[PDB]
Structures are given as structure tokens and as C-alpha cells.
Amino acid sequence: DIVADHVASYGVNLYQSYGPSGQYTHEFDGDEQFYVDLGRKETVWCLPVLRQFRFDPQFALTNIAVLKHNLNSLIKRSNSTAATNEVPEVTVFSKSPVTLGQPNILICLVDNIFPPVVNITWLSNGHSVTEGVSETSFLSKSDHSFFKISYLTLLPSAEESYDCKVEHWGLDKPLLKHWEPMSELTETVVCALGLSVGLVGIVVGTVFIIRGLRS
Amino acid sequence: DIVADHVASYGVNLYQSYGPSGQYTHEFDGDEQFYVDLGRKETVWCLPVLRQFRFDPQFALTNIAVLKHNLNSLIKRSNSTAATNEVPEVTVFSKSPVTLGQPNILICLVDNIFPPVVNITWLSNGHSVTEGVSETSFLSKSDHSFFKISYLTLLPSAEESYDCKVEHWGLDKPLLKHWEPMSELTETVVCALGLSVGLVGIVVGTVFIIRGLRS
Amino acid sequence: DIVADHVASYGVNLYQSYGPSGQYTHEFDGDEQFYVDLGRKETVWCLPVLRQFRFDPQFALTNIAVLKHNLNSLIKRSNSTAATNEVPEVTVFSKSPVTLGQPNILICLVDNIFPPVVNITWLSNGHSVTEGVSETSFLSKSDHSFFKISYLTLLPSAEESYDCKVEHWGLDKPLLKHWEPMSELTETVVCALGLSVGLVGIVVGTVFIIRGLRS
Amino acid sequence: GALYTGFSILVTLLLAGQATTAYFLYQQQGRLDKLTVTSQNLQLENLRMKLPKPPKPVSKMRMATPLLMQ
Amino acid sequence: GALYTGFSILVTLLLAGQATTAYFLYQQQGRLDKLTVTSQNLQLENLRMKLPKPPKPVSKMRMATPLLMQ
Amino acid sequence: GALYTGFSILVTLLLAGQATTAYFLYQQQGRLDKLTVTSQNLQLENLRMKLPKPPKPVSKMRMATPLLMQ
Amino acid sequence: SPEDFVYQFKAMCYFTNGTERVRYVTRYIYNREEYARFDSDVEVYRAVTPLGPPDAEYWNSQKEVLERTRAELDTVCRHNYQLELRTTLQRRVEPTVTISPLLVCSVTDFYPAQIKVRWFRNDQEETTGVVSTPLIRNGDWTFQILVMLEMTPQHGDVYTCHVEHPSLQNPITVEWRQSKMLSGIGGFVLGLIFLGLGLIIHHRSQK
Amino acid sequence: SPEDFVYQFKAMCYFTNGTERVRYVTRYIYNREEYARFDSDVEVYRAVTPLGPPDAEYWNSQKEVLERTRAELDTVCRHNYQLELRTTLQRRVEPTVTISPLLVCSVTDFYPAQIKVRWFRNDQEETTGVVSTPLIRNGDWTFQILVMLEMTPQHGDVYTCHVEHPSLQNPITVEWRQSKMLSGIGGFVLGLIFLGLGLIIHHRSQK
Amino acid sequence: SPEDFVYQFKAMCYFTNGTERVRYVTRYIYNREEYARFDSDVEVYRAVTPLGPPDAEYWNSQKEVLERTRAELDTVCRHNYQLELRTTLQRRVEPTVTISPLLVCSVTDFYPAQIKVRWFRNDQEETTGVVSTPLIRNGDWTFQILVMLEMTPQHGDVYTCHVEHPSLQNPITVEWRQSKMLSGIGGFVLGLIFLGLGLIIHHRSQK
């Protein structure tokens, strides 16, 4: 292992035979700086302060073409050893403390993903949600696995609940991770002070006469 | 005629000698999927869920170049038969039920347009409006005419009225289609319950003494 | 000098040896129509109604390449006469009348800039502000100097003050231009009318009995 | 003694006025509840204006080409 | 009998207090009317953020080119 | 004479009711002050949505290239 | 009115049922006059107006081009329709229903165009008089429809507008129904006099 | 202070009246020193400073290039000005006027720069003391102007700021004008005592 | 479970201190099994698994390519790190602290990951029981951390959560503390009876 103040991975290239599909990302201290959409040949920056730089998308496509040729030469030498599917770990938590009404972003973290093939979807009372849902790219680990994050911009409601549906080859059945978010006492308290302050003002008005009565 | 569940027109190409001008649109069940801005060589998608696909703008320009050559060969054989200008039909209606204050979009539908040359503008108390005005492309029909729609994002006001000015060669003069969007009773009703509930509370206070008077 | 109704400068090209850096802008009646980002080879229009036109960014790069070659031939003939640094004039004012709470844009106008090298930054109680800050391009003058404007979209607060930090070679030290934006009387006035209107209603209620007393 | 008669009218008018304040106070709470929902729905839009969506694989649409008139 | 004297002051203070509630209730209705306009003007912006405009024909701007110093 | 006894209860209940109106009136002013801040923070976003930023000079990021397996 | 010549071309795919049956017609129009057409159920260029034979035979003569257009039934209609399943045919928007005074039931902002709207009079389908405005295409992949019916007002009578749409698993129903102030005025004033009288009776009985 | 050399080039078109008269000058500047220039009213390159003759004759020698630049009066100035009519010269923004305490009349966010502002004292144009801040160019195609005037306050006296602008069909005029609480206090208390006295008089007359 | 083969490549730069020391490792992974690697502290390709010698010697044989990769320590790691100083290493976001009932102190939306959080019990650092949830990476260049501690409630006792972060010049501290209605009820009612009694005493003394 290597211990350092900052770690940057400027060559994270991915390729697999299932699609075939690939991915290109740059990482600095565990966060994604940008990714290159291979199909559209465009560089999408993940941080606003990083849009001032330039990275040629064609640079990414050249690298992944090498990985494709490398993989075919390795399948023969490995005698076609398929990837051992793993069991993902799914954790759901709120980005900010949950206050009813204020906008919030749900975070579903799928960890230990291998191969990089997963379907992360959101459920609201059994119905799929396709509004305000965003995902991050497959982010690398040190054991050569991946983790992905799905966001759900939601308005918290006490009557509404959500689930994170994670489908992967390593799960026998689809995995669901759940997430769920005084009037009488206040009325009694309000009335108690009301009659008290009412009697307090009444006493002074009566006291004023009583004090003035002697004179 | 042809009867089918769904109708798609993946080759709607337009060209005319007046500009000269042309248009390229794709239609599915009578709605516009996208259009290719010929001058800017760009593909503008009209539906957000359709931006994930790709259509080369240069493909559209090749097709319309063929229509230009085809038209010149047809003008000679037709002995220069000019287009017979038609009388457009203009209908103005609100996209949503008109509630004063809530945002709404006006819809002006110009139907039976031929040739595809029309000026659709909005008037507010006699002055042109150039804010929040948008239009759709010339959408095809079965009699080989066209219809166009102009939108006016407006905030309804009881003191404000709007008109849709449609200029076409088939109209002798420009056509205008117009569109226009309890306190005393409420005050009397509020006062009536006020004195009634006032007397109701007064009676119980007097009744409480009267009941307690006997004891 | 030349006197005319409208003045347009369709060839404002800039180049200097410090960077080396350059600039391309089009001006009409003293306002910037667009600029061509030389590094990114993109045309950024400064007025929304002007986005309908097209200007090739490569056109700007050809012109500035000529200025670079012209400058090297002039440095020899001028025997390397460096630019005489000037003293900028800094003025800070609000775009709209300052009402506490309503959004506003601060305007810092640095005038008489030469050479076109300046750092304009905003300070809020001694700390740099990097949110909502925008600047205009170096706009030309008639004495062949420049002026630049920096905007600071701010929400006015009576407890918050701002400064415009202007750094230039012609200033010995950095220049700072500053900008800074009844309850008892209202309470007494409210109480004065309260007891007055209270006594006014009391009199009529007593007067009603007095008038009815005689009958 | 008509003094107590006068006080009787004042109290009834005073309580009638309090009904009006209660009615308008309840009326305004409808606006605030409605304005709260609109304000927080607008805040949600802002939140989504700064979040993109992971793109799907690119599949091209298909077209037809006309022919030439000789 | 000073009991009726005491009740006299209480009613006047009670009606004085009701004037204050009415004044602040009227004051808040100015904010709600102003906030309603700002909320619905912001809703209008959102509505326009999702609607483009049909482009006009493209006409290119013209420029001048400098010369070379031999 | 129980008539004055009756009036005594009415005034106390009347002032108790005025306390409730004052409490809810103060309560609503918290919402308006909070709603005012959210409304004007949303107005600020709109203002910034129409203002770009002068770009910085372009500097390219660097990458590494893998090798071929013979 | 300046002279103008318009030439338009349309490539139309017709999908009956699923991909079971598909028709492909390409239409050559010259000023609202289609003269040459291709029919997939004929697979041969035809002429509609006398301006056709010059182009019908020539296009059909070139076998290489004729085979290219005949193959567009699969490479254009069937290729694009696969993408239509994921995005456009999958689009569904829930309708909104409002009732305002006849009595108009406005159903707005829904897609697709299949919809059924019913009017009820206390669990009785009021089919006596119903006038339906035809489907209105807003242009933004949305639709409208207006249904109105005459009313004979009655005390306690209610009217409900019943709608159903492919986007909805459960149908949506919306109902419609100084008077309250007047009703409370009589009850309170009578109650005000009701309690006042008992004071004298209690006073008289005690005395 | 590092040494720096600045070279700038300007192509300026001047439009007097409509397209009736146009001047075209191209300026070659070397560190705020214009040395070579083209004048459409001369159609011949000239030299301004001693650094000019080396470039003035050489550029004028090439007839092909010299004719190219002389033709830019039509292909640059007159070509672009046609587009200026539709978008920039057509831009008009209505001014906004506010009055605050001298007494400053702020006219903000207007375009173009033509404007006339007047101060009135009860339908009398107060021209005694008026200090005008010059036109301020905000930079965003907008303009400002501030007008202030000294005041001698009077009871019931009003002041109105009068503005006019090419974007406005009708001129815009804005006016300016515890005291209310104090005034009502005296009237109500006097009315409070006015009604109270009548009770004794009615009591005395009845008695 | 369809068969799938995954090949991944990683170019990782390690920055110890400033640019004083830099390590550069390129990793060739075949299904979570890194077989060939480059180490800047070795400057020679090595083999990790038996699938390495076929590629380790061949890549190291080509001197032109081997020198190219060894030079990436400066043209990739040190080139990019200069840009990291201006934008990413310069990014700092102030944390937000909220306290809710144990007692959890939520610190949300901060960057970078260096942070220290303390719990106080009346200016005494409560270190008896504190359970800290590890750093949570939201994914949007933000971080979280949750600290909870058990409480023994006391009258007038307060708890403050103390945080410090590189983005903050001064540490941020947030504190936490019908009862008011009940307390006022006893005081007012007692005061109500307090004034009432004096009326009789004044009446009795006068009488």
C-alpha cells in the first residue's frame, strides 16, 4: 500500500465484454473530476470550477481502444476466466438533516460492485420515479471494485416513503433499501398562558382602582 | 386513406421558391420530434426524452438539396403553376383553465396554411409583444396543408387583453383573433355571521349566570 | 475628431507581449456586441438579441496573428519603447437605487487602463468574494486607453460593506474603492391613534345612550 | 341608569370586531400555506437546475432519402 | 362604588389593544400581496426556462482585416 | 344583582380571546420573515442565471496512455 | 401576392398492431398535389396525377435505387420504431380535471389521446345532454378535451365528472356542489333569544 | 513593473444621418500612438507619427490590397449596419424613475442614451438650482442619469420629476409629497369629549 | 448470470508533502487481478501474478516506449498537479452544524475531509461516551460526519458541539438547551390573587 497526502488517478480506463461498454474518468482524492461520454464524444465536467480547462474527448477513445485489444489477448491466456460476481452493499441516507418541506437529496450508495453492471432505481410506494434522479460514474476502489451513487431530489413528506432498488448479477433477487422520514399539548399550553395573562391584566386594572380608592 | 394505430412521418421535407427556404421535421402521432435548423446546421429536439438520440444535421441538408433540384424540373413540366393561396383558420384558446394570477400559456392555432409563409404575432392593447413568444414548426396535414402554433407565456390580468395577428397572402387584410379572461355580498355575509356569533357567545355568558342564579 | 449619430467599431483587435495575450470585440455605440475567446475558439455574444447571427471565431484568430507579426516589426523601429503605465480611475456605484433586501448589482468602473493588464476583485469585510462576480471586456476609448467593469450581484444588508480592489502597474499600492448602503416614533404614533380611535368609538357608544336617553 | 346600557353596546361591538379579526387571521393562513408550497416547489426546481443526468447509450434515428427527377 | 370604575379602564384598554391587532393585521396583508406578486413572477420565469424560440434565418456579421508590416 | 356577574365573565373571555389572536399574529410574522428571505434568495438566483463570467485562459489537463499486449 | 412554388416530400410509416403489419408510403407533392408515390403493399412506384409517368417509370427503371427504397421498410420504419418504444410510446402524462360553471369539465395536459369522460348525477350517468369539444392538440405533446352538460339545480344535489386514461391505474373523479352565514345567523340569534328568556324565568321562579 | 508592448487595431465606421453619409477609418495604434490610418474621405493611407512612412507607402503601393480595404466601406460598414437596424438600433428599454431625499430623481435602466429630464414645482419648471450627473454607462446596454435640486419645504407643496425618452410614447412623471396619527389624535379626543358632555346636558335637561 | 470479462487500467499519482516527493504507478487489472505494474521508485515494469512475464519483459524491451512512460511522472502528475492547486486544492466549503435528539451533532456539506469535532458539557469536554460515524462521501465533493453522545438531563444544563475545519478561520460552536406556559400560569394567577386581596384591605381600612 501507498500512504500520501493526496491521491490522483488520471488514467482510470474501463472496458468490458458485456456491452461492449467502457468508461473514462479522472479522480482526485476520491471524487470524480469529469467523464468522457464515449458515444457522444463529449467531456462532461463534474465540478463547476473545473470547466475552465480542456480535455480532448478523442484522447479517451484512443485509450479504451487499446484496452479492448489488450482484453482479447488476455482472455486467451487466462483460458476464459469469467468475472466472479460479487454481492453489492447498499446504503441509503439523507444528504442533509431531514426537515419536512425543505428540499433534500437522497443518497443511495452501492458498494463492492463487480462487474460494473448495475441497475439503480428509486421506488415511491411501489411506483418507479423518473424525476430528479441522477447517478455518478463507477468510481474506483483499491481492491479493484467499484461504487456508484444515485441521487433523488425529493421534497420530504411525512406520508411518503422511498426505496432504492439495486439489481445486480450477484443478488438472487433484487435488493431494496428502505428510507422513511404535540397539537393537544400546544393548545393546552397556549390556553394556559392566555387565561393567566388575561387574569394578570385584570388584576392590575382592579388594583389600580383599589390603590386609587384609598386616596 | 390508411388506418393504423400509430403514424410516423420520418421524411417530412419542405422547400419553396419564395425565400428560398426549407424545413426538416420528424413527426410521430402528429407531434414534432425535432427539427434541423438548416442555416445553423443544428438538430433541435422538441421533446426532452428524445435528446438521448443522435441525428446528423447534414443528413437533412442533403435531402432538401434534392427537393430543390426536383422542384426546378417540375416547374417546367407544370408550365409554372403557382401555388393557390388559401384562407387560414385562426383559433385562440388557453392551455389551462384561466385563473387570475397563475402562469398560463396562450395557444394560437393557425390552420390550413398554404404556402408555408405566415407571420404570427401577439398584440397586447395594440402594442406588439416580444417577450415569452414561441412558435412551432409547420406541421403537416393529410391534404398537404400545414398548421402552426404560437405560444404566449402570460400572467392573466383582468385589465389586460390579447390578440393573435395572423398575416398571410390569402387574407385581404391582417386577421386578428381576440382573447379576454362579490365584495359587497361577502362583506354583508361576514358581518351577518359576526353579529350572530357575537350574540351566541353573549347568550351563553348570560345563560351561565341565569342557570347559576337559581342555585 | 469625427461627429456622427452612431459609431461602430467592427475591428477592435488587441495584442500585447506581456502574456502574450489578445482580445477581439465588436462595439456599437460604446457597448460590446460580442467577444471571441481566443483560447477556446468560441464566439460569446453579449446581447441576447444578437445570438441570431453568426461570426466565425477563426476569423478573429487570423487578425490577431497579423497584429503579433506587426508588433515585432514595430518594436525594432521604435527601439523598444515600453508602454508608459497609467494611473487608473476607479468608481463604484449601484446599478439601481439601494433598497435593503431587493437584489442589486454593484458596478466598479476602472477607467484609463493602460496596458490592458488589471486585477479587479471584490472584498466583503476583508475577505475575497468569488460568487456572483462578472466582468466585461476591455472596452476601447478615443485616447487609445481602456475601461473595464466588474459586477457583483449582491443582496444589500445594512450590516455588510463592500470594496473594489483594483491592482495595476501604475498604482504604488493596490487601490480600494469603498461602498456602504424610527421604531420608537412609529410605536408612539401607533399608540397615539390607537387610544384616540378607542376614545372615538367609546364616545359614540356613550353618545348613543345619551341621545336615546332623552326620548 | 343608562350608563350600563351604554357599556352593553360597546362590549357587543367589541366582540363583533374580534370575530372580524379572527376571520381575516384565518383567511391569511390559507395564503401562507399556499405560498409556502409554491416557495418550496420553486426551491426544488433550483436544486434540479444544478444536477445533470447520466447519459444513456447513443442510438441514431433513421431517415429516408428522396430521389432525383432524372 | 369603584368596581364600575375598574371595569371602565379595562374595556378602553381592551379596545386599544384591538386597534393594534387590526393595524398589524392590515400591515401583514401588504406583505402577502407583495409576496404573492414576487412568487408568481418567479413562477413565470420557470415557465419560460423550458420554452425555446423558433430561430430566425442566419445572417453573418462582417469584419475588417488588418495588413502586414512588410 | 347577577347581571354584573355575567358581564364579568364575558370580559375575561373576551381578553382571553385577544391573547389568542395576538399569539397567532406573532406566529405568522415568523413565516413572513422566513418566506421573505426565501423569496429574495430565489430572486438572487434568477439574477445570476442571466450573467456569465469572463473566462480564464485555457490550460489542458494531461493523461496517461496504456500500452499494447504485443 | 407574390408567386410561390412549394415542393414537399413525406416518408410515412404506418404501424398496425405491433410490428406485425407495417405499411411504408413515400409521397411526392407539388403544391398540394401528390403525383408520385411508393406503396409497400405494391413495392412499385405509381403515378397519381398526369405529372407522374415521367418520374414513375424512370425511378422504377433503376433496380439498384428501387431495391434501396423498398428496404427502407425495415431500416427506417422498423429501426426507428424500436427507439419509439423506449421514449415516445412510453411517455404518459396524468390528466388534470377541473369543474367550473352549463357545467364544463376541463381535462387538460394529458398524453396520449385515448381517454373516456363521463358525467354523473348522483350515481346516475347523465346522458341526456352532453356536448363534447373534440380533442385539442396543444402542440407540446399534450391534449385537451372539454365536456359540458346542462343542469337542473337541486338542494343537496351533486355532480361528478368521471375520467379514465391509459396513464392512470385508477380513474380520477372530481365532484361539484353567504348561505352558510345566513344559516348560522338564524340559528345563533334564535339561540341568543333562547338563553335570554331563561334568565327572566329563573328570576321569576326564584322571586 | 515589467515592460510591456501593446499593439491595437481599430476598424471604425461612422454613420451620419441614415446610410446617406458613411466614414470609414482604420487606425493602427502602437502604445496609445496611432501612426498609420485610412480615411474614406481620402481613400489613401496616411501617416500620423514618424513611424508611418515606412508603412504608409508600402501598403499604398499594393493596388490589389489598397482596393480591398477601400471596398470595406460597403462590405463591412454597410453590410453590418443593415443587421444593426433589426436588432441593436431596434432595442428600446423603458426607463424607471424614483424620487428620494436635496431631492434626487434617479432614472435607471434605459436605452438608448437620448433622454430629457425636468423638475417641476407645482406646474412651474424649477430651473433655479439643478445639478445633473452625466450619463452613466452601466455596461449592460443600459444607462443612468441623476438629477438633484434644492428644496424649500412648504405645507401641501409637491414636486414632480418629468422625463421623456424615445422608447416612450407618453412621458412618465413621478411625484413626491406620525403626522397623520397626531392629527387624528386631536380630532378624536375632541370628539370624545364632544359626545361625553352631551350626556350631562341631556341628563340635566331631562332632570 | 451471463459471463463477463472486465479489463481496467489505472494511472495513479501519489503526492507526499508538496511536489517534494511523487510516486507514479500504472496498474493493469484483469478482473480484479492486477498482473503488471509500473513503479516510479523502480522505474521498471514488474509482474504481480503469473500473467505478467509475457507482458513485463516485452514492454520493458522497447526502450522508446519505456522512456515515454517513465517521463509521465513529470508530464502527467506534475503537469496536472499545478492545475490542481488553482481549482481543486483551493476548494473549501464551510461546514454546517445542527444538533438534534442520544444527542447527534450532524456536520454536513464540507470539503476537504480534515475535521475535528468535540462535545462539551458546560465547558467540560465530555469524553465519557462518544460514538462517531466514519466520514461519509456524498459524492458531490462534499462530506458528512455524525457524532453522538449519551446524556443525563439536568435543569439548566447545556451541551455545545465544537467543530473546526481548514476552511474556517474561527471554530463554529452550536449549543442545545409548555414549561414556559406553566411557569407563567402560576406567576400570573398568584399575581391575579395578589392584587385582588388588596382591594378588600383598602376597602376595610377606609371603612
Numbering used by the authors:
A (entry chain G), B (entry chain D), C (entry chain A): 2 to 182, 188 to 221
D (entry chain F), E (entry chain C), F (entry chain I): 47 to 116
G (entry chain E), H (entry chain B), I (entry chain H): 3 to 103, 114 to 189, 196 to 225
Paper text:
pmcThe major histocompatibility complex class II (MHC-II) molecules play a crucial role against pathogens and foreign antigens in adaptive immune responses by presenting peptide antigens to CD4+ T lymphocytes. The assembly and trafficking of MHC-II molecules are regulated processes involving invariant chain (Ii), which acts as a chaperone associated with MHC-II subunits during MHC-II biosynthesis and antigen processing. Previous studies have shown that Ii forms a homotrimer (Ii3), associating with MHC-II heterodimers to create a trimer of trimeric complex, Ii3:(αβ)3 (6, 7). CLIP lodges within the peptide-binding groove of MHC-II, acting as a “placeholder” to prevent premature peptide loading.
